[model samples]
Target chain A: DLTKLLIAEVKSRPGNSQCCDCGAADPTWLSTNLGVLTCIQCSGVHRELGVRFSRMQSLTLDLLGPSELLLALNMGNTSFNEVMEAQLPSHGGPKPSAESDMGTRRDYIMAKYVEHRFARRCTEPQRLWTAICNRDLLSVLEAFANGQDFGQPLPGPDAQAPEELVLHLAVKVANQASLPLVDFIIQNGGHLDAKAADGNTALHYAALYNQPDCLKLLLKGRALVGTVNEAGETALDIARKKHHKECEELLEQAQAGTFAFPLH
Target chain B: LTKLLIAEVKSRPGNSQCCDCGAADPTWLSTNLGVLTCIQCSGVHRELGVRFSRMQSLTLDLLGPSELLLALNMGNTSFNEVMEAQLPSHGGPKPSAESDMGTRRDYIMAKYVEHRFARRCTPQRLWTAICNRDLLSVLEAFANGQDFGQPLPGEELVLHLAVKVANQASLPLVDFIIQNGGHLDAKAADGNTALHYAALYNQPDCLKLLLKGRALVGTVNEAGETALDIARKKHHKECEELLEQAQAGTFAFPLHVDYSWVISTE
Candidate 1:
């Protein structure tokens, strides 16, 4: 179902069927992890980045499974870079051009993808994040000593609270692959209904950010789908606001329980 | 003799068609070279200072026995073979029925003017590159390697009054040359400016365009008449108003002066 949506959505993007980086416009390879459509020329650069940076697949030949497709669908090159470049970090030069040397493309793409420099802000919390993301479920259980009391929200510090919140950090970096970790946090009694200091809850986030399974996991925890935050708009209202048709449909499905028409 | 001329030229190697581009049914030819060519090649030859080739129409030139004898010398089968020999292969750049005027022009200039082989001749994309206003082509036109100048029949520089058509459609070309220090005040052999020619021709747009480029309205021609003075003599009221506007130092239209004038030599 998700792959069907991505196959449909990727058609309307720039370099539509082209390699996202090289622009052959007939990209034979798909970056398995990043969903970046790339040509055969740059597919080798992807292999050099390793499985941590990408999963490689032939556009014409290789079939993608759910986890691979979900990560690819989670953020296209557009939105992946959107999340990666949010804080506006400085760089020495422009990104390596398509004609860039192998060393240049490697260093640039390595810093952006392999090292994960631009996506998460401020260096340290990213380490705690890797264990949770790597699915080393026990590595996460050992760390964050005394981790499980729905973390305290300082009054009036919504989204700006001291920046050390791990669960919030989990929400910040979660993708569809990271869906199980969200379930992990909720099952560990880690505050499904907990509001940031500004009163926006995690359901508010799941809808706004386009994480369908994360929304499902939050709802499975019995998180309220109709509840509003300081903005007085429910998760459904926000999904509709952002034009997230996947989240919109998912939220609508959760609201309707059946695909039946409303009584009104 | 005129009918005999056609049959005679048709019998020559490439004379029934264009001598320069090998186009078919070409009634045109360079009068000086005696070689039959096409209308498109004629436009090109008109721009090449005319000493190398001066064009005329075979059917229309109303040839007598003497000129027919000249055509025999111009486009004979042996003569064409000796002259147009060893042209490089053209996949489709052949001046055939499919080729347009622009294509024919470049190919003709290459064959007759540049005298280079088809491979060493015009790059095919240059047909549109010139019309597309490609900036590289623009800078390249004036750079050391190529010649993009024009010459008039009389004392006026090609862009001057002697050429007799300051126009609105080609003002960008006019601006390009003038900006590159073209002689705006160039006086013809008869001592009239470009404005005088436009006024005499009753073209108000070129008159205004001349003023837009600061063409002096007050400069007297050999007959001691200003452009306004000439306009009034010719009863051209619009041309008079344009001259009046220039003298007022206002209404900066920067209107187009000419188009159809970019003539890069082979």
Candidate 2:
């Protein structure tokens, strides 16, 4: 029942009506890691490409992990092609059509994916940091496809700490909309307890900035509540000083290893 | 080799500290990841589960040469150079000898599980690691979820690559790849499986390992030949006999496999 629902969900995303690679109608196969939908012909090529480059799955035939399917939910054909095919228009080669020969499809895919000839050079750490600050998950996904290292620390000379990583930055600039971005970073490789130069962590930033929701997210991720900063202040201490009772309450519960307040 | 590894673990000046948090007099080791860790760090590794890092006690648990060879090939110094390359550039503080479990867990999760501070993995790096028999580097790639089943530019999977490059000393490395993720029967561009390559190359040991792992012996390639056919045609008597026994289902492996090929000259 969930498989059919998930399949419908994938089809509802933008650019899923056609093959992501060749514009074939009603793609049935999926590249799980890349989050692109393709036809059977292109799917066969994807299999030949290797799992490292492209892992193929049948959207209807295969029983997939619900969480693993979220990657496709978050990144559909429209957003994925935006970064991967950014340079294709100017690269002076025609993309293979559904009717094109297998060799043509093979060569084009080799350049498009394997060689990354058409991928936009958006791997700049600053661009990714800025995207996170703006809470733009699409651009963040684009940056990830461009090979941006999510774990890289944010460059200093700003209000954020020099040692502040993407996780800390996500917390510092967090909003209700930023939860997905924060979760995405954590899932990819963000260090939960990573501290800035001032010995403040993502938790400290959440408390200082009155981000109660972000505080809960970090706690659920198993971020230590008792971690003391260079000033010997825990997140709870900062929250108490800032008069952020919501954050304080969550931190207190986390420290005791049980939440007094029910979280939805 | 077990005796040699024990001696190295006990006597090597560099082996005295935990590889993860730098705790002194470390007694734990991740056999697969090939780094000596402390008690707390080892607990964290266990929590990460065996897929990420398999833990063994240096003083308590029985160790094998394959696991021991992996640990010896990669100590803290070499392992950190790859896994912790970003540590210096990292702005956060790392755990110390007296650090609490929480602090240790955070940094170790980032370092090992998330690979936050590690060198970015690439297919080229994985290929190089396989060729060099650098177990830790290979594990690093594996931990990052790099595909061992992926084909290289030369149309060879890592299994085939390992088969082509394997020697007496690197048998452990070969077997490790197979056990972890190497596709035993995956075909190359020429429709040659790792089994076929083993037979063609006259590697009876690799063939035996494949057979023991239950590699399909009857799959024909583009040349309309099975692995046994290739071995017989190529006059690989050792491989031919083994393939024959396997085809007849008369293949019997030792209850306790020995790593006689893994000589510890050092």
**Candidate that would win on DockQ:** 2
Candidate 1 deviant stretches above 4 angstroms: A1-5, A13-28, A83-94, A97-101, A115-264, B1-266
lDDT of 1 by residue, B215-242 (tens): 5445566677778789889999977876
Interface RMS deviation of candidate 1: 39.7
Q: Which ten residues in a row have the lowest lDDT in candidate 1 chain B?
A: B253-262
Instruction: Write one digit per residue (lDDT tens) for candidate 2, span B65-86.
Output: 4446556666777778777877
**TM-score for candidate 2:** 0.48
Fnat, model by model in order, equals 0.00, 0.01
Evaluating just chain A, the predictions reach TM-scores of 0.43, 0.62
Among these predictions, the greatest TM-score belongs to 2
Candidate 2 clashes between residue pairs 3 or more apart in a chain or in different chains: none
lDDT of 2 by residue, A1-264 (tens): 754666788888899999988999999877765667999889878767753456566676543544335456656788878878887774456688889999999888888877767777753666776787788987876766566655457674456546457788787888654666775665444245455567687788989999876775565444544656668788889999999998888777666542211111
